[PDB]
Amino acid sequence: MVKLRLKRCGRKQRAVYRIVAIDVRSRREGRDLQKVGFYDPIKSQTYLNVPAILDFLEKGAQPTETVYDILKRAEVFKEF
Amino acid sequence: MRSMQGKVICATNDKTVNVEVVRLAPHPKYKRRVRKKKKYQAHDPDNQFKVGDWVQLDKCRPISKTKTFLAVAPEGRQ
Amino acid sequence: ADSAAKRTRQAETRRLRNKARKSEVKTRMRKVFEALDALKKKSGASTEELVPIDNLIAEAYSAIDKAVVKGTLHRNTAARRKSRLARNKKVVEIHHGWYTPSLAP
Amino acid sequence: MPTIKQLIRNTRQPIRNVTKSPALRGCPQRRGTCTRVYTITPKKPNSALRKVARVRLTSGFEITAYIPGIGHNLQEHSVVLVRGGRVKDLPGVRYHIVRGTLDAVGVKDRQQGRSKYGVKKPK
RNA sequence: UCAUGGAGAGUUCGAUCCUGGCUCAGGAUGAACGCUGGCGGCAUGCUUAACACAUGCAAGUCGGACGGGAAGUGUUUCCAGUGGCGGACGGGUGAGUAACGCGUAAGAACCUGCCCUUGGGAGGGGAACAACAGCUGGAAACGGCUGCUAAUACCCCGUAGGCUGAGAAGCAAAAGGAGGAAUCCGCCCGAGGAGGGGCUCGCGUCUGAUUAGCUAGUUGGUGAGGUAAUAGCUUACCAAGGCGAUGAUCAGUAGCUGGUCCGAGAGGAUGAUCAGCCACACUGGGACUGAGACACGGCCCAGACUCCUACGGGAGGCAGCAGUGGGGAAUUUUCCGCAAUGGGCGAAAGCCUGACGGAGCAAUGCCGCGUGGAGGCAGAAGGCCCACGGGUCGUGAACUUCUUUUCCCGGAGAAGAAGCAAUGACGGUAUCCGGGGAAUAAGCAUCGGCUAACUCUGUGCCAGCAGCCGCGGUAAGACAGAGGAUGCAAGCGUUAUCCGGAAUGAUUGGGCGUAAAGCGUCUGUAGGUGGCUUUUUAAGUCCGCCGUCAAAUCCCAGGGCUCAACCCUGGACAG
């Protein structure tokens, strides 16, 4: 399926990452149905948009490694 | 979408009618309302359309190369 | 040999599956060929009709045998087996459609 | 030209900005091969001996190009680098030759505006 | 309130008004060349020959599917082979393609391994094929008999909410592995969904009439086949249709679009990097497997070309990354790393990624910063010019102090890396602290009008300049030099391409008595526009709501890099 994954969105030596739920066959910087999330590893926030991640994980788009690790920081996981 | 109402041109083919469809269109650079005609092949198993009647085209499964519509009847609210 | 082949390994397996699928699709063409052949004969000159259908049904069962068996292995999608079993029973329904079984919707 | 039908046929179109250099036809300046290094005269109001090199180009044309500056090294069959720009006085000369580039030396002893003539700094 | 936008000038003539053309002032380049050149941040880097390509690398993985063997001496690491997925993604180029290829908007006739949800099932048998051993052919590339072997590899029987058929009837499947177990990964048959594809259609999609007819599977219909699916997709027969002067057919050009640039605006030109879709992979043509290709680094054939050969034969596709050669005015390093991110495989461990993350060179571009700050008797040395009085270079310098962005010499030193720890190519980079020291650092155009800047010496229709007008025949504010000035600034100029100016293709926005231009006049087809009142539908029109026009860009507002460039978050008018 769809695989919720980051994409690099920034300058050189910056690493401002989006969390996009695109199809896994696409290149890493493509297009999404809905670009759900944010991750700034230098130091800043991470907007998550919980209902849409629950929509796609409720559908069954498995995430990658560190997207899943961000999803294990917060308490997003509910099986409903 | 909409149907495409228009006159029947010539029905000398079984289950098949040519239909002129008249369409107003704004010409792009100059702002008038130019008509463009485009004629189609529609399907009818009943083939109950003579020359000169006017029908409404609705999209269906393609029947031949050109025959991709079947036309039934307009509503007729005058 | 070389430490990495990776594609000649494919082409080896492609040669093998070419042999198997070529062969057993040809079996399907042979059994459908015999069914339509005997149906052509009993359309031509049979003169007793509701009796000898047991042979046509027997070979038609062998046709549905190898048809659906090659539907299991991946060489025929659904709506290939559907179209060709429907083809054989179109032909059977036509040979009975000329004659003594009377069928009307 | 009414808005109706003499003009939703077409007005007309102007052609282009017509090319002011028919050679150089890719882009700005192009390597040349000297064929003649003769000298011609301008039209009637002027009076000079302007020294032009008729030059074959790498494009596929042959064209008579002007040689700027005072001194010139250009003998038969040398290599130059022509550029665009119309010398008015000479009928037919459409092009210039860059000085200081390949096999066409800079002008002798010039100390005002050297980048147009390919002379490095003194002092 | 809205408005954040619109400049002229030269040249026809003894003069004037006007038409009209050319030329310039403004931006932008994927740019090129010349002169000059301190640093940093972020981008960009064959536009040409889709032209050949040396060398290395660019796609693997799985021993927890299976059999063997080969290092290590119960224990583990490997391995060619059979299998499983991945090689259809990612990367590159724009030759073709004026067409549902693309863009946008609807639709029904379909498929879909991996991914979630879900209903049921896995009994019984059996034959080999690699590997391997032997013989043997070849320089190699590869083979060829003889035997043998295992499986999630193949075959057969039974069983099936599936299929065929009107029913009658029949038909169809399985695979084990890991673990002590527990269980987990699987497998087979179904049923949905998401995503991905395959089709169809409305509308938009370059020029040329000095290309006017085209089309006979052509356009329909049926029957037979065929496709995952509709279909002249294909075939036999019947019908004569179908397209076109609103440009068919032919010829030529061109990847397309979010966008970029310009413009006040309408819109004009254009499609590099960024991103989505298409097509191609030496030139052609085929098919095979799989879910999915007619497959860049797969197979087969033909053609051309290069390499090897022991002369019989083989091998090859850089428009992957670096690189060489050619062409060109012109476009880089045969670099480091999987640390992140994203892929592929695996139960995990991990492995592989020239994608990507970085680094190097180049003022190629956009932005920021410095080359000193303050004082400097108004006295001297000098250049240039002068009615020889002087003026101007000039507070400029010299000279006195202050400071160290940068520079040199030392110390420290990151995050980026993800809560088990460990895990960094970048790199001892960024940044900070200390010690000297004005030290290490300004050029390039122009100075006749547009156009800001001017005098002097030399030249004498010569040398030359020039964007247009035109200067140059002895005192040139136009050539060459000096001084001075101007404008810019690590840039400055020339050229080329595009838009503006240009209302010089005109809807906004022009004209036709004489300046370029009314057919010689008339009839009339197509087509265009059309009197008044009343009534009806709403196609146009207008208003509300809703869907969509990907993300990035532009606009507004915040936020982050010491600011800016750039990056990021949210929002939206238009249309």
Swiss-Prot record, chain A:
Annotated keywords: Chloroplast, Plastid, Ribonucleoprotein, Ribosomal protein
Mark the transmembrane ranges. none
Q: Which domain of life is it from?
A: Eukaryota
Principal localisation = plastid
Task: Mention one GO molecular function.
Answer: structural constituent of ribosome
Gene Ontology CC annotation, any one: mitochondrion
One biological process term from GO is: mitochondrial translation
Q: Which Gene3D superfamilies match?
A: 3.30.1320.10
Its subcellular locations are: Plastid, Chloroplast
SUPFAM superfamilies in the record, alphabetically?
A: Ribosomal protein S16
Task: Fetch the InterPro entries from UniProt.
Answer: Ribosomal_bS16 (IPR000307), Ribosomal_bS16_CS (IPR020592), Ribosomal_bS16_dom_sf (IPR023803)
Quaternary structure, from the entry: Component of the chloroplast small ribosomal subunit (SSU). Mature 70S chloroplast ribosomes of higher plants consist of a small (30S) and a large (50S) subunit. The 30S small subunit contains 1 molecule of ribosomal RNA (16S rRNA) and 24 different proteins. The 50S large subunit contains 3 rRNA molecules (23S, 5S and 4.5S rRNA) and 33 different proteins.
User: Which protein family is named in the record?
Assistant: Belongs to the bacterial ribosomal protein bS16 family.
Which function does this protein serve? Component of the chloroplast ribosome (chloro-ribosome), a dedicated translation machinery responsible for the synthesis of chloroplast genome-encoded proteins, including proteins of the transcription and translation machinery and components of the photosynthetic apparatus.
Name this protein carries in UniProt: Small ribosomal subunit protein bS16c
Which lineage do the record's taxonomy fields give for this organism?
Eukaryota, Viridiplantae, Streptophyta, Embryophyta, Tracheophyta
UniProtKB/Swiss-Prot annotation, chain B:
Its protein name is Small ribosomal subunit protein uS17c
Q: Where is the protein found, in the record's own terms?
A: Plastid, Chloroplast
Q: What role does it play? A: Component of the chloroplast ribosome (chloro-ribosome), a dedicated translation machinery responsible for the synthesis of chloroplast genome-encoded proteins, including proteins of the transcription and translation machinery and components of the photosynthetic apparatus.
Q: What is the lineage of its organism?
A: Eukaryota, Viridiplantae, Streptophyta, Embryophyta, Tracheophyta
Instruction: Tell me where on the tree of life, at the top rank, the source sits.
Output: Eukaryota
> Quaternary structure?
Component of the chloroplast small ribosomal subunit (SSU). Mature 70S chloroplast ribosomes of higher plants consist of a small (30S) and a large (50S) subunit. The 30S small subunit contains 1 molecule of ribosomal RNA (16S rRNA) and 24 different proteins. The 50S large subunit contains 3 rRNA molecules (23S, 5S and 4.5S rRNA) and 33 different proteins.
Q: Membrane-crossing residues? A: none
- Protein family: Belongs to the universal ribosomal protein uS17 family.
Curated annotation (Swiss-Prot), chain D:
The record's section on Pfam families has: Ribosom_S12_S23
GO-annotated molecular function: rRNA binding; structural constituent of ribosome
* Location in the cell: Plastid, Chloroplast
Q: Is RNA-binding one of the keywords UniProt gives this record?
A: yes
Is the keyword rRNA-binding in the record? yes
Residue ranges spanning the membrane: these are none
Record keywords: Chloroplast, Plastid, Ribonucleoprotein, Ribosomal protein, RNA-binding, rRNA-binding
Recorded GO cellular component terms are: chloroplast; ribosome; small ribosomal subunit
**Domain of life according to the entry:** Eukaryota
Signal peptide from the UniProt entry? none
Q: SUPFAM superfamilies of this UniProt entry?
A: Nucleic acid-binding proteins (SSF50249)
Q: Which cysteines are joined by disulfide bonds?
A: none
Instruction: Give the record's GO biological process terms.
Output: translation
Q: Which InterPro entries match?
A: NA-bd_OB-fold, Ribosomal_uS12, Ribosomal_uS12_bac
Function in brief: Component of the chloroplast ribosome (chloro-ribosome), a dedicated translation machinery responsible for the synthesis of chloroplast genome-encoded proteins, including proteins of the transcription and translation machinery and components of the photosynthetic apparatus.
Q: What else is known?
A: Exons 2 and 3 are cis-spliced, while a trans-splicing reaction is required to link exons 1 and 2.
- Assembly behavior: Component of the chloroplast small ribosomal subunit (SSU). Mature 70S chloroplast ribosomes of higher plants consist of a small (30S) and a large (50S) subunit. The 30S small subunit contains 1 molecule of ribosomal RNA (16S rRNA) and 24 different proteins. The 50S large subunit contains 3 rRNA molecules (23S, 5S and 4.5S rRNA) and 33 different proteins.
UniProt family annotation? Belongs to the universal ribosomal protein uS12 family.
UniProt-recorded name of the protein = Small ribosomal subunit protein uS12cz/uS12cy
Which gene carries the instructions for this protein?
A: rps12-A
